[PDB]
């Protein structure tokens with residue numbers, strides 16, 4: 001791709017390193033570290049996530065982070081794709097990529113923490129279920145990720161590692177697709193022939209759906225991921241319905257796991273379908289609408 005070579009609109013993206021208050025670490029990789037920070041005037045004060053290139057990084061590592069920055073800029077804006085807010089690329093400090101901060105963390109861990117705080121739907125008095133998750137929340141998250149993937153697809157992208165661990169949750173129940181840089185999430189064609197396409201991302205989306213409606217459980221419980229797993233997968237064996245799913249959502253997972261990639265729904269069809277399911281669920285209770 002050589003994305004690092006793309007023109008850089010510094011007036012639009014460059015942020016002064018001295019306008020950042022660096023905080024607690026959020027993660028680390030071969031590239032360096034990601035830390036939480038407060039930025040002033042990146043749009044006031046706003047909390048952000050900063051991916052920083054380690055000192056003494058190799059040329060390939062440096063090139064890789066710059067590439068990621070240019071790719072994020074190329075992709076463009078979408079509510080459900082982690083928002084790039086700026087970068088620090090000029091001399092005087094490390095290369096830094098700045099994104100919005102999602103306070104609730106990854107979806108897998110978050111959902112897991114709400115297992116004792118979930119009900120299919122609230123009933124008045126609703127304060128008995130304050131901050132509880134409901135089927136509406138779960139369908140909503142599913143819908144948003146589909147919207148985000150439909151967007152990435154429209155921009156000719158292939159995610160390749162779609163999973164709950166790569167989805168962050170921000171305020172107002174808005175989720176963001178990320179790629180922090182996965183056999184249980186791979187389509188058969190990917191496992192056996194290393195083939196990656198938007199349709200294999202759909203298969204992974206199906207696993208993500210299972211993760212969502214199991215409230216953060218690990219895929220394929222009780223199964224060792226080995227040649228026997230691959231044999232049975234290719235044969236048609238699929239995960240059973242998760243504990244918090246609806247019949248419609250489970251069939252959607254099955255659809256996403258069709259053996260033939262061309263027969264799996266497209267993200268556009270998933271957006272349509274999940275949107276309808278969400279609307280039906282959101283307007284179902286007429287209690288407050290007399």
Ligand SMILES: Cc1ccc(C(=O)Nc2cc(CCCN(C)C)cc(C(F)(F)F)c2)cc1Nc1ncccc1-c1ccncn1
Nearest residue numbers: 026027034049050051068099100101102177178179180181
């Ligand atoms: C700072 C930063 C920079 C870039 C990204 C990120 O997802 N980048 C990225 C990069 C790419 C292309 C490059 C992929 N490489 C494998 C890295 C695609 C996406 C897409 F489209 F899938 F969303 C996303 C996440 C983050 N955020 C982050 N990273 C590591 C740990 C924790 C966070 C975090 C915590 C809370 N709030 C926001 N970010």
